[PDB]
Write a protein that binds this DNA or RNA. Structure first.
Lengths: 64, 207, 86, 103, 201, 125
RNA sequence: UUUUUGUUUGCUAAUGUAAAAGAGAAAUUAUAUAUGUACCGGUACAUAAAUAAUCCUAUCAC
RNA sequence: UUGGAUAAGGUGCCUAAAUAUUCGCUCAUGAGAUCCCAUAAAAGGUGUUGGUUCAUAUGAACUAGCCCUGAAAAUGGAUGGCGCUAAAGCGGAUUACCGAUACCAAGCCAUAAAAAGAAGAAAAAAUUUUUUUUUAGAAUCUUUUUAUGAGUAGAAAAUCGUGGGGU
RNA sequence: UAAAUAGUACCUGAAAUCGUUAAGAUGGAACGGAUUAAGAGAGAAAACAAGUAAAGAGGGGAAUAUUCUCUUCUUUAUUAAAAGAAACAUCAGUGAUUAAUUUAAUUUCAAUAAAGCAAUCCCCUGAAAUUGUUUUCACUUUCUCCCCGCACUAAUGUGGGGAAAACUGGCUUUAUUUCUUCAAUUAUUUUUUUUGCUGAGGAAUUUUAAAAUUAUUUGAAUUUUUCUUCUUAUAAUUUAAGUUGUUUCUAUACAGUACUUUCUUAACCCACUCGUCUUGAAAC
C-alpha cells in the first residue's frame, strides 16, 4: 500500500495500473456541508465546482 | 501481565470463557477464543479516602467513604454505619459521584489512615456475592408479610459470609467514629443527604 | 474466504504495521524525536532565530520593492489622469 | 425534606423531525437549565427515565418507566436527542422526564 | 417552561413577538397567563394599524356573517387570536396548547398578587428604534369598538395604589429582617460567619 | 417494525392488506398487486398501503422455523414420525386437523416417547 | 362535616390525570433614564442600573 | 433496516433548526419578502443614501440604491397564515445548526456474476464412568465473496390455488 | 328422535341487510399508512429446572409362566444447568465532542532592564523634484507652557494662534523569554476528555501464516534508548484471526396485574376515488 501511495502521489511509471486497480472512492458527505454545488469555487459568491487546487485537501478530509 | 501497543499498558487480567455455541459442521465449541481481557481502568478522581454520593440504591443520595478497589471494577464503600447508617456496600463506580474531599486530608484522620487500610485490605467480592444455599433458604419461605420480612432478615444475618463483613464494618466504624464526630460540620456533612436544589445547575457545579 | 470486520488500517496498530512494515520504525522515530527535553530548544531558540536576520533583510527588501512598484504605478496613473483632465 | 431528587428535569418535545415528516427513533428533550450546545453536550451519556402513571396495576404498581439514553445534542439551544428502548408515545409530548446523574 | 404557570405582564411588549414566544411556550406545554393586554404595543402608526383592522373587519362570509371570521375587539382577545394564528389549533395537541393560554385586560383577582414576568426579546424599548412609530393596543381597540379602555385605566390606578401600600409594607419588613440578620451574624460561631462572608451571604 | 426474538428477526409483522379492502366489502383483504393506471399504491404515494417486496424476506438461516426454534412437520399417522426419530431436536410435530381422537392420542404418546414436541397437543380433549 | 380500610340478570363497593419531586418569588415606571424620602409638577437628598448572573427556602433523626 | 453525515432549501411561531453574529439601506394613509411563479410600463419626486463633473462651504447639473406617485373590479382574502420595522424586509459577509427513499459504515432479502467443492469428533455438565447437543455432502445442490435493486405498454421465469385422471 | 337451532319455507346454512347484549368512540364525513401507548380477549410449542430417591397407577423388550431391563404419568424432597433481558466493563467497526502535539515554511510579534539616536522626527505612510538612482516638507503625544475668546466646552474643559521634550510612539546596541509573548496559516507527525450506534460469523487439514505485544536470547545498526529499530531462537498473549465476561432479574412460576400475540381505542406525522380513455384525472 505504501508503493501504491507513492505511485499515486508522484505520478510514477506505474500510475495507470495502480489507479485502475483501485476501486473508485465512495466518499461521505462533507462534515460541515458544501457552500453551493450550483456555483463555481472561483465565483466571488460561495460555490463549489471547479478546480480547488490545494483546497481539495480539507474537503477530502471532511468527506473521508 | 499487560500489553502496551502505541505506549498504553492496558493491563490484562484472566477471563473465563463459558458461552458455548454450535460449530458450523459437526461439533460445539466455546465461543470466546480469548484468555485475557484488559482491566477496568477506573476514574482518576477515585481514591481510597474520598467521600462519594450514592445515586441508585435504597441509600441513594447518601454520602459514603470509599474503602477499596475490589479487583473487579466495583469498589467497596462504607458510609460508616455508626455515623451514617450506610453499611459496608460494594458499589459500581458509575453509580457514584465522587467529591473532592478526602477523609484523610484531615489532620486527626491521616493518623489512622494506615489502620483503615489494614482493616480494608481483607474485603473481597466473594464476601459480597450471595450464597446459593442462603438464597434457596430465603426463597423457600415465599411459598404474614411481616414474618416473611423478619425471616429474610434473620437468614441474611445468619449467612456466615455476611458476618465477616459486619465485623469489618464494626471495626472500621469504631476506628473512624471519634475523629469523624469531632469534626462537627463534617460529621453533619456525612450524615446529610445530597439533594439537587432548583438553583444548582449540574453542568456548572463541581462534583 | 469469509469476510470479517475490516480493521481500521490507520488506528489498529497490528494491521497498520502489517500493511506498512516501515511504520513501526517511522512512528518510533517520531516518538523519540518528540521526547526531546525542553531545555535544549529553550537554549537554542535564539541561536536558531539570529541566523535568519539576512533572510529577514532580503525578505523586507522584496516587499518594499513591490510596494514601491505599486505606488509608482499609482502615481503614474494619477499623473496620466491629471494630463487627460486638461 | 424527604424524597431526594438527584436528577435534572426535562420535557419531551416531539420526535426527531422535519417539516411534515417524523423519525420516532429519537425524541427531542429540553433540559431545565441548559440553553446552549456546549452545555447540552455535558449530558450525553446520561440515562433518561420517562416515569408515567397508569390507570390500573401491572406489577402491583400504578407506575412504569420507559428507559432511554441521551445520544447527542440537537440544534444550538441545548435541546438533546434521546433514544429509548421503545418509542415514547406522542401522547407524552410535553411531559416530564428525568435526566439522571448516572452513569 | 418548568413552572406550574407563568404570568406575563404584557405592558410594553410587541404583539407579534409576544405571541410567538407565548405560542412556543404553550406548544412545549407551559401554561401562561397574559395580563394587561390593553398595553400591548404594535409597530407602525396607530392609523396604519387601524387601517389593518378595518381591512380585517371588511372580511366576512357574505352568505352568512355568523359563520364569518369573528372579529373580537378586546385587546386580550386580539392577543389570543394572534397566538392562535401562530399555532396548529386544528389538531388536538394544538387545541390543548391554545386552551393552556389565559388572557386578561388589567389584572384580575388572583394575578395581581403573584409575580409578573417580562420577555425582553419582545419589549418595545429593546426592539423598536426610538424614531419609529408604534401604537397602543388598547387605543386601537377603543377606536375599533371596544369602549372599555377608561374603566380598565381606573381599575389599574386602584390596583397601583394597593400595590404601593403592599410594597411599602414589604420594604419595611425587609429592612427589619436585614437589621435582624446583621444583629444575628455576630451571635453565630466565627467559622460559620467566615463561611457566609466568604461566599457572600 | 422489526421484531427480534433471539436469533429470529421478523422483518415485518401486520401482513399486507389489499388496497381499498377496508372500505369495500366485495374487496377481500388478501393481497393483490394493484395493476391500475393512477392507483396511488402502485405509484407508491406517501401514506397508503405499501406493497410487499422481496426486501422483507426473512433470513434464510431462520426462515421457516417456529418460535420454539424448530421447523414444524404435520403428521396424520403414527407411521409418519420415523423421520423425526433422527430429527427430534430441530423438528416439532403438529397433528393434522382431520385426525380422530384415537389416532391423536396414539400420536401424542409416540411423540412423547420420541421426545418430540407437539404444537397442538391438547386438541380434542 | 372528621378517622380507618380499600378502588388488585348488564351492573349494584370503588380511580382518574396533557403533566409534583422546592413546579418557591405580588411595585411602579422610563428606556436620551427611573424609584423612594422630605419640603413647596418643582427643589434637595439617597437608592438602582450584567437587572432572577438575585433572594428565599430545605437534611440538625429518636 | 440501524446509526452517521449531507443536498436542495431553510433556522420568529405554524415547522426540525439562529428572535445567531457582523455591515449598510428602507417608513410605505394599500412597504417588502425563494428560479419556474403567478403582471407592471412610459413619465415623475425638494424622501433619503451614496457617487461624478462643474462654479468661492456654499450653488448647479447629472448618476443609481431603497422608498413614493403613476397603480381602477366585481362573494370576503391572502409574501401560505400569523405577524414582522434595534425585521421576522432588501444587498452582502461569518459561523453553527436543521434537513431526503440521495451519500457513508454495518446487518438481512432477492437478482447477477464469481471463488470452490462428488469424510473426521467438538464442546459442556455431573462422577477414570455417564449425560446433553450435534458429527453435514441433496450439482437448477452446498459454502463463501462482490456488486446491484423505479417502472406504464410489453416479455419471461419461479411460485400459489380450483374441477377431473393415472400413480 | 341420536338430533327439532332436523317441524314440512324442514340437509349444510355464507355475504349483503336488520335485531339483542356488552365494550368503546363521537366539535361540518368515515376508513386508512407509519409509530407507540392504554385497555380487553386469548396463550406456554424457546418464553427455567435436566437428572436422583421413595411410593402409586400402568405399558413394553430381553432373558428359561419366573428374572432383569426400558420407559409414561401422579405425589413427595432433591439438586442442578441453560435461555432471555438489563447494568457495568473489555475489544473491534463506525461516528460525535474537547484538549492538545513534533518538525519545518511563511517579513509575525510582544515584552523585561540598562544605555543611545531623531523632534513634524522616527518603523511606517503621504505630497512634490528612456528604467533605476538621488532630494525636499509633512507626518506624534502631552494629565506641558504662553497669548487671544480669556469659562467661551460634548468634557473634570474648550476654539484659534505660537513654543517645549521625547513621558508616550519609533529606531540602534547587550542579557533574558516562566514578568510578559512565542501568534496565525500551511505542510509534516503524535496524542487526548466525555460519549452514541453496531457484534455478521463460528473456520474436520489457512481464526493458518505472518503482524503486534510480553518475558527471556543472538548479532547488528542507530536517530543514543524504561514504546529505538532490524533478526536468532524459545514460550506465551491479542492490538491478529467480525463480543466477550461478571452480577442481578425473569424465578426458586406453570399462565397473572408479568411476558408473547390479536383486537379496540386514542395520540404525533402523513393520506383526494377506484377502474378507464388520455400529454394530462381527485376532477365540474
Amino acid at each position: 500500500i505504501e508503493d501504491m501511495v507513492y505511485q499515486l502521489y508522484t505520478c510514477g511509471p506505474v500510475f495507470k495500473k495502480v489507479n485502475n486497480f483501485l476501486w473508485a472512492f465512495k466518499l461521505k458527505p462533507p462534515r460541515k456541508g458544501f457552500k453551493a454545488k450550483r456555483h463555481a469555487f472561483n465565483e466571488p459568491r460561495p460555490g463549489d465546482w471547479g478546480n480547488r487546487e490545494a483546497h481539495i485537501n480539507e474537503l477530502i478530509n471532511r468527506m473521508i | 501481565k499487560h500489553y502496551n501497543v502505541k505506549g498504553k499498558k492496558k493491563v490484562l487480567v484472566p477471563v473465563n470463557a463459558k458461552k458455548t455455541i454450535n460449530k458450523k459442521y459437526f461439533g460445539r465449541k466455546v465461543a470466546s477464543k480469548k484468555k485475557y481481557v484488559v482491566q477496568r481502568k477506573l476514574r482518576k478522581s477515585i481514591e481510597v479516602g474520598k467521600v462519594a454520593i450514592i445515586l441508585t440504591g435504597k441509600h441513594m443520595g447518601k454520602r459514603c467513604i470509599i474503602t477499596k478497589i475490589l479487583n473487579s471494577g466495583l469498589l467497596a464503600v462504607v458510609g460508616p454505619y455508626e455515623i451514617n447508617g450506610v453499611p459496608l456496600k460494594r458499589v459500581d463506580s458509575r453509580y457514584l459521584v465522587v467529591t473532592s474531599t478526602n477523609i484523610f486530608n484531615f489532620e486527626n484522620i491521616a493518623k489512622l489512615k494506615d489502620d483503615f487500610l489494614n482493616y480494608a485490605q481483607d474485603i473481597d467480592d466473594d464476601s459480597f456475592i450471595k450464597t446459593l444455599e442462603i438464597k434457596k433458604k430465603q426463597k423457600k419461605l415465599l411459598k404474614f408479610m411481616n414474618n416473611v420480612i423478619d425471616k429474610i432478615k434473620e437468614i441474611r444475618k445468619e449467612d456466615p459470609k455476611v458476618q465477616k463483613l459486619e465485623g469489618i464494618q464494626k471495626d472500621i466504624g469504631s476506628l473512624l467514629k471519634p475523629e469523624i464526630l469531632k469534626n462537627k460540620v463534617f460529621a453533619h456533612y456525612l450524615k446529610s443527604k445530597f439533594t439537587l436544589r432548583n438553583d444548582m445547575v449540574l453542568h456548572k457545579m463541581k462534583f | 474466504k469469509k469476510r470479517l470486520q475490516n480493521k481500521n488500517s490507520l488506528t489498529n496498530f497490528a494491521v497498520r504495521c502489517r500493511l506498512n512494515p516501515a511504520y513501526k520504525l517511522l512512528r518510533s522515530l517520531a516518538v523519540l524525536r518528540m521526547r526531546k527535553s525542553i531545555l535544549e530548544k529553550s537554549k537554542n531558540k535564539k541561536e536558531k532565530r539570529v541566523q535568519k536576520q539576512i533572510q529577514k533583510k532580503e525578505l523586507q527588501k522584496i516587499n518594499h520593492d513591490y510596494y514601491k512598484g505599486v505606488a509608482k504605478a499609482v502615481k503614474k496613473k494619477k499623473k496620466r489622469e491629471e494630463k487627460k483632465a486638461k | 425534606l424527604q424524597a431526594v431528587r438527584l436528577y435534572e428535569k426535562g420535557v419531551i418535545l416531539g420526535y426527531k423531525r422535519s417539516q411534515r415528516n417524523q423519525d420516532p427513533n429519537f425524541t427531542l428533550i429540553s433540559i431545565k437549565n441548559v440553553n446552549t450546545k456546549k452545555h447540552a453536550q455535558f449530558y450525553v451519556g446520561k440515562r433518561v427515565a420517562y416515569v408515567y402513571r397508569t390507570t390500573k396495576h401491572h406489577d402491583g404498581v400504578k407506575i412504569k418507566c420507559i428507559w432511554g439514553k441521551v445520544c447527542r445534542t440537537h440544534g444550538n439551544s441545548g435541546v438533546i436527542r434521546a433514544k429509548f428502548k421503545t418509542h415514547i408515545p406522542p401522547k407524552a409530548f410535553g411531559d416530564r422526564v428525568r435526566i439522571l446523574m448516572y452513569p | 417552561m418548568y413552572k406550574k404557570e407563568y404570568v406575563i405582564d404584557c405592558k410594553g411588549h410587541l404583539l407579534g413577538r409576544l405571541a410567538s414566544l407565548i405560542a412556543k411556550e404553550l406548544l412545549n406545554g407551559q401554561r401562561i397567563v397574559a395580563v394587561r393586554c390593553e398595553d400591548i404595543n404594535i409597530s407602525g402608526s396607530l392609523y396604519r394599524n387601524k387601517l389593518k383592522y378595518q381591512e380585517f373587519l371588511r372580511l366576512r362570509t357574505n352568505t352568512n356573517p355568523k359563520k364569518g371570521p369573528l372579529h373580537l375587539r378586546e385587546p386580550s382577545k386580539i392577543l389570543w387570536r394572534c397566538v392562535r394564528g401562530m399555532l396548529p389549533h386544528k389538531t388536538y395537541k394544538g387545541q390543548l396548547a391554545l386552551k393552556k393560554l389565559k388572557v386578561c385586560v388589567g389584572m384580575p383577582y388572583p394575578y395581581d398578587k403573584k409575580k409578573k414576568y417580562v420577555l425582553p426579546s419582545a419589549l418595545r424599548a429593546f426592539r423598536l428604534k426610538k424614531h419609529r412609530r408604534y401604537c397602543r393596543l388598547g387605543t386601537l381597540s377603543s377606536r375599533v369598538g371596544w369602549n372599555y379602555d377608561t374603566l380598565v385605566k381606573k381599575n389599574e390606578v386602584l390596583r397601583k395604589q394597593v400595590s404601593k401600600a403592599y410594597y411599602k409594607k414589604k420594604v419595611n419588613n425587609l429592612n427589619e429582617k436585614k437589621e435582624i440578620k446583621t444583629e444575628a451574624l455576630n451571635l453565630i460561631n466565627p467559622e460559620q460567619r467566615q463561611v457566609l462572608e466568604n461566599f457572600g451571604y | 417494525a422489526v421484531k427480534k426474538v433471539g436469533k429470529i428477526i421478523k422483518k415485518r409483522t401486520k401482513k399486507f392488506t389489499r388496497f381499498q379492502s377496508n372500505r369495500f366489502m366485495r374487496v377481500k383483504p388478501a393481497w393483490r398487486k394493484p395493476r391500475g393506471i393512477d392507483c396511488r399504491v402502485r405509484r407508491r404515494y406517501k401514506g397508503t398501503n405499501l406493497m410487499p417486496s422481496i426486501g422483507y424476506g426473512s433470513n434464510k438461516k431462520t426462515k421457516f422455523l417456529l418460535p420454539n426454534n424448530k421447523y414444524k412437520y404435520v403428521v396424520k399417522n403414527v407411521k409418519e414420525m420415523e423421520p423425526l426419530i433422527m430429527n427430534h431436536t430441530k423438528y416439532c410435530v403438529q397433528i393434522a386437523h382431520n385426525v380422530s381422537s384415537k389416532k391423536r392420542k396414539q400420536i401424542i404418546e409416540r411423540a412423547k416417547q420420541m421426545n418430540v414436541s407437539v404444537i397442538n397437543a391438547k386438541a380434542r380433549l
